[PDB]
Write a protein that binds this ligand. Structure first.
Ligand SMILES: Nc1ncnc2c1ncn2[C@@H]1O[C@H](COP(=O)(O)OP(=O)(O)O)[C@@H](O)[C@H]1O
Ligand SMILES: Nc1ncnc2c1ncn2[C@@H]1O[C@H](COP(=O)(O)OP(=O)(O)O)[C@@H](O)[C@H]1O
Ligand SMILES: C[C@@](O)(CCOP(=O)(O)OP(=O)(O)O)CC(=O)O
Ligand SMILES: C[C@@](O)(CCOP(=O)(O)OP(=O)(O)O)CC(=O)O
Ligand code: BEF
Ligand code: BEF
Ligand SMILES: [Mg+2]
Ligand SMILES: [Mg+2]
Ligand SMILES: [Mg+2]
Ligand SMILES: [Mg+2]
Lengths: 327, 327
C-alpha cells in the first residue's frame, strides 16, 4: 500500500519580479511576473506515500531535515493529501542541483519538483495549468518552473485563475544567457516569504512598485516581439532595482544586498560602458545575475574575472519545463 | 573702492534629510529638515568686491577654480549683488576644512561662509533669520549651518518663510557625537542638486518619502524633549535609509552607496547587537556617519578599527553657528 512518483524541475529567474502576496494562504500575488527557466540549476525529487509510514520525512541533499526545516514541506503535503483524500504519511527525498535559500530560486525548482512528484504518485493527472496552480501553493515562483523558456505568472484573482503559462518568443530565449555572480551561496537571513510580507505590510515604497509592474510587463512583451535586447535589459534592470528599493522603506528597513552585490552591479555598468550589452538583476539574496546575449558571454566572463574567481561565474541558458517520472 | 568681509561656517549633518526642491530657483524644499552642526569640519571664506576687478574669481584650497567650478559661486554672487545693487566683480578665496563634494556637507559650510562674508562686506546687517535665508539660495543645507547644535529648516512656502532656526535641547547635543567612516573622500559622480532633482521628477518612491517626513520630524522633537537616544537613533537611521531608497526608484535609478558603505552599515548593526547603541546615516555620497553617545565613542572606534584604519574614523561633536569677521 504505497504510491510513488518522481519529478525534475528547473529553476527560473524572474525578469519582472513577484514581490508580495495578496492572499497568503493560497499564495495569490499582488502583481503578475515573468521569468526565464534556466538549464544550469534544478531539483530532483521523489515522494513515497505509504500506509506504513509513521510521520512525514523530508531528506534534502542526503540530510534529514529537522522539524523547522520540514514545516513547509509538511504544509504542502497536507494540501495535496486533502486534495486527494489521502491519509498516508510521506517520504520526500530531494536533491538540489542549486544552492539552497540563497536567492537562486531553490524554492521554485524545489516546490515545482515536489508538486510534480506528488501529482504522479497520487495519480492526479494535472494539466500543465493545474500543475502550475498546485506548485504555486508551495512557492509562488514554483508555478513558473512548470514551463520552459519564458513564462508569465498571471496574478489572476483566485486559486483557479492564478497560474503561469509559457510565452512563445520565436526561440529568442535560445539566443540568451544569464551569468551568475556568486557572492555568497549561504542561506539568507530573511526568507523571500518573510521579506516580501514585511514589504507589503509596512513599506512606504510598495505602492510605487505596484504602480509600475504592468508597464514593465508590457515593455518586456514588446521587446520580446521585436527581439530588442537593450530594451529588455533596461526594463528588467530597473524592475530589479525597484523591487529592492521597496525593502529600504519597510519598517524596520532591510536590504538583501551585500558589499559584493554592489561591486558586481557597478562592474556590469562598466561592462556596458566598454561595449558589452549586459544588464543585472537580483533576487532575495546577495548574488547578482547578468543577462547577456550568448555572443557576448565569454567576453563578459573575462571582464568579470578581473574581480571574481572562475568558480564565482556560473553560466546558464534557457531551460526546460518540468519532467515527470513513474517509479 | 573695495568692500571686504570674512566668515567661518561649520558643516551640519541632516538627521531628517532635505531631499528635493519645490522651487529650484529659490531653493525652497519639498520637506522640512533637521540637522546637527558639527565642530570637526568647516569652511573659512573671504570675499573682496572691487571696482578694479575685471571678472569674478574663486580660489578654493589655493587652487583657481575653472569656469565650470565657478558657475555656482558666480550665481550666488549675482544674487547678492542684485540684492545690494552692487556692480563690482568679486574675489572669493575659500579653504575647506572638509573634503569637497564627497557627501560631507561642503556645500553647507561653503555657501554659509560665502553668504556670511558677503553680508559683512556689503554691510547687509542681516539677522540670523535673514542670513539663513540668503545662505539657502546658495545651497539648501547652508541655511542650517548659520546655527550651532540642533537646527531645523522649515520648508515654509516662499523666499520669506523658508529658513532655519536653532532647536534648544537642554544641551543634549553636547552629550552626542557623530563618527565619520570615510570610505571615499573623492568627488561624487551625482551632485546633491542633480540627484535630488532626478528623484523629485521621476522617482516612484518620492511620495513615500514625503508621506513620512513630518512624522519623523515630530518623533525627533519628542526624543529631544526626552533625551531618548535609542528612539532618536531609530528614527534617523530609517529616515536615511528611506531617502536613499528613493534613488533606486528614479528613472534611470542610481545609488550613492559603494561596497564599503554597506560594509560599514552592517558593522554598525553588529555594534548595536553587541551592546553599543549607535545608528548610521548617509548623505549624497558613500561615507557613513554614525551617531553615538560620547560615552560609547571610543568603544565604537575600537570595534570599527577591526575593519577600518584609524585615518578612516573621524569623530565630530556639536559645533558652533556662523562666525562673522571684519577685515
Ligand atoms: N528541494 C526542496 N524541496 C523542498 N523545499 C525546498 C527545496 N529547496 C528549497 N526548499 C525550501 O525553500 C526555502 C528557501 O526559499 P526562498 O527563501 O524562497 O529561497 P530561494 O531564493 O532559494 O528560493 C528553503 O529554506 C526550503 O524551505
Ligand atoms: N568653500 C566653498 N565655496 C563655494 N562653493 C563650494 C565650497 N565647497 C563646496 N562648494 C560647492 O559645493 C559643491 C558640492 O556640493 P554637494 O554636491 O552638495 O556636495 P557636499 O556633500 O560636499 O555638500 C562643490 O562642487 C562646489 O560647487
Ligand atoms: C525576489 C523573488 O525571487 C521572490 C521569489 O519569492 P518566492 O516565490 O521564493 O516566495 P514564496 O512564494 O513565499 O515561496 C522574485 C521572483 O522569483 O519572482
Ligand atoms: C543628502 C543631503 O545631504 C542633501 C543636501 O543637499 P544640498 O543642500 O547639498 O543641495 P543644494 O540645496 O542643491 O545645494 C541631505 C541634507 O543635507 O539635508
Ligand atoms: F529566488 Be529566491 F526566492 F530569492
Ligand atoms: F552633504 Be552633501 F550635500 F551630500
Ligand atoms: Mg525566485
Ligand atoms: Mg524562492
Ligand atoms: Mg549635506
Ligand atoms: Mg551639499
Amino acid at each position: 500500500a504505497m504510491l510513488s512518483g518522481k519529478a525534475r524541475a528547473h529553476t527560473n529567474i524572474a525578469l519582472i519580479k513577484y514581490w508580495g502576496k495578496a492572499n497568503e494562504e493560497y499564495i495569490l500575488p499582488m502583481n503578475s511576473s515573468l521569468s526565464l527557466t534556466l538549464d544550469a540549476f534544478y531539483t530532483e525529487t521523489t515522494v513515497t506515500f505509504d500506509a506504513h509510514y509513521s510521520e512525514d520525512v523530508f531528506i534534502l541533499n542526503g540530510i534529514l531535515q529537522n522539524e523547522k526545516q520540514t514545516k513547509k514541506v509538511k504544509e504542502f503535503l497536507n494540501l495535496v493529501r486533502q486534495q486527494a483524500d489521502c491519509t498516508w504519511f510521506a517520504k520526500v527525498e530531494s536533491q538540489n542541483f542549486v544552492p539552497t535559500a540563497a536567492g537562486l530560486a531553490s524554492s521554485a525548482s524545489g516546490l515545482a519538483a515536489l508538486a510534480g512528484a506528488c501529482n504522479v504518485a497520487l495519480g492526479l493527472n494535472l494539466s500543465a495549468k493545474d500543475l502550475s496552480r498546485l506548485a504555486r501553493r508551495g512557492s509562488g515562483s514554483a508555478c513558473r518552473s512548470i514551463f520552459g523558456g519564458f513564462a508569465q505568472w498571471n496574478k489572476g484573482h483566485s486559486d483557479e485563475t492564478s497560474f503561469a503559462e509559457n510565452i512563445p518568443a520565436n526561440n529568442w530565449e535560445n539566443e540568451l544567457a544569464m551569468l551568475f555572480i556568486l557572492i555568497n551561496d549561504g542561506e539568507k537571513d530573511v526568507s523571500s516569504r518573510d521579506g516580501m510580507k514585511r514589504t507589503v505590510e509596512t513599506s512606504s515604497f510598495y505602492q510605487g512598485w505596484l504602480d509600475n509592474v504592468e508597464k514593465d510587463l508590457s515593455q518586456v512583451h514588446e521587446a520580446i516581439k521585436t527581439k530588442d535586447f537593450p530594451r529588455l535589459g533596461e526594463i528588467i534592470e530597473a524592475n530589479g532595482l525597484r523591487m529592492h528599493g521597496t525593502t529600504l522603506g519597510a519598517v524596520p528597513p532591510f536590504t538583501y544586498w551585500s558589499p559584493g552585490s554592489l561591486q558586481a552591479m557597478a562592474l556590469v555598468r562598466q561592462a556596458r560602458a566598454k561595449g558589452i550589452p549586459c544588464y543585472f538583476t537580483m533576487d532575495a539574496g546577495p548574488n547578482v545575475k547578468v543577462l547577456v546575449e550568448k555572443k557576448n558571454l565569454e567576453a563578459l566572463k573575462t571582464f568579470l574575472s578581473e574581480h571574481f574567481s572562475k568558480e564565482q561565474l556560473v553560466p546558464a541558458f534557457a531551460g526546460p519545463g518540468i519532467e515527470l517520472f513513474e517509479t
